Amino acid sequence: DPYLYPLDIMRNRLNIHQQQRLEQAAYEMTALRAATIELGPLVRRLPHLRTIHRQLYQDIFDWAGQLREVDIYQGDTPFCHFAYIEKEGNALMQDLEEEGYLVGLEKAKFVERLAHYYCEINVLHPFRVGSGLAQRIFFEQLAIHAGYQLSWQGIEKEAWNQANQSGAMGDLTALQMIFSKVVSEAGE
Amino acid sequence: KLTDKQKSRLWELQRNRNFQASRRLEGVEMPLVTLTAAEALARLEELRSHY
Ligand SMILES: [Cl-]
Ligand SMILES: [Cl-]
Ligand SMILES: [Cl-]
């Protein structure tokens, strides 16, 4: 992996040489950075998603904000091939833009479109570390611009990952069910 | 929360709660950050010094 030092450990800006200590420093520093992220714009394409990631990881990795350059698996299931991320990401953002960023939608339709876009970006997995985190911030902000709000509270991780996987295989039922709960009216 | 100032206030009220819960979806339990953005920046500067 080109992200590793020529060991067990990802190259990083904090000169940490123990993987577990790097993990912990990232958990702490990303959480403080997330406390500084602003809402951002209504019009949000791939560069805005990259900006979220840059913001989160700027203390940890030189490559914060940059697209992933290697292939990654969750088990035996690959995420988007790295050389295709920019093409697929841009196309997906273009579909989102043509739907006006999901603005003006009744709740059932918002939930349905949100599950779809969440599922597509999840498979894209545009960053080497923290893709999930950056994606969810992107959609939390999007929801507020669209008159809704997201809460991830009380969603089980196993259910979450299974829903995303089923969705990527062509059945969004489980992910839409999760989003029906995650989504409420903005300010409610 | 239709106005830009209302949307921003909502975002500020929820962003930290959301990041905590978001990280939990990755299987990691972290305490809630309650710092303001300016306090978080000052604390980041201390943490960079610490490494
Ligand atoms: Cl170390
Ligand atoms: Cl991380
Ligand atoms: Cl953008």
Residue numbers in the entry:
A (entry chain A): 10 to 15, 17 to 198
B (entry chain B): 3 to 53
Task: Reproduce the article's own wording on this structure.
The E.coli Fic protein EcFicT forms a tight complex with its cognate antitoxin EcFicA. EcFicT adopts the conserved Fic fold, but with a distinct active site signature motif and an additional hydrophobic binding pocket in the vicinity of the active site loop. EcFicA forms two parallel α-helices that tightly embrace EcFicT. According to this classification, EcFicT belongs to class I with the inhibitory helix provided by EcFicA, a small protein coded immediately upstream of the ecficT gene.
The G55R mutation encoded by the fic-1 allele caused cell filamentation at non-permissive temperature (43°C) in the presence of high concentration of cAMP (1.5 mM) in the culture medium. However, the EcFicTG55R mutant in complex with EcFicA (EcFicTG55RA) yielded crystals that diffracted to 2.0 Å. The best solution (TFZ = 11.6 and LLG = 206) was obtained in space group P65 yielding two EcFicT molecules in the asymmetric unit. Our crystal structures show that the G55R mutation encoded by the fic-1 allele, which results in the cell filamentation phenotype, does not affect the structure of EcFicT. The arginine 55 side-chain forms a salt-bridge with glutamate 107 of helix α3, which is conserved in EcFicT-like homologs. One could speculate that the glycine to arginine mutation may reduce the main-chain flexibility. However, despite the additional salt-bridge, the G55R variant is not more stable than the wild-type protein, as has been shown above by DSF. The EcFicTG55RA crystal structure revealed that the site of mutation is neither close to the presumed active site nor the presumed target recognition site. Also in EcFicTG55RA, such an intermolecular salt-bridge is observed (E28–R146). In EcFicTG55RA, the flap is stabilized by crystal contacts and is fully ordered. In the EcFicTG55RA structure, the base-binding pocket is nevertheless partly restricted by the conformation that adopts the glutamine 84 of EcFicT located at the tip of the flap.
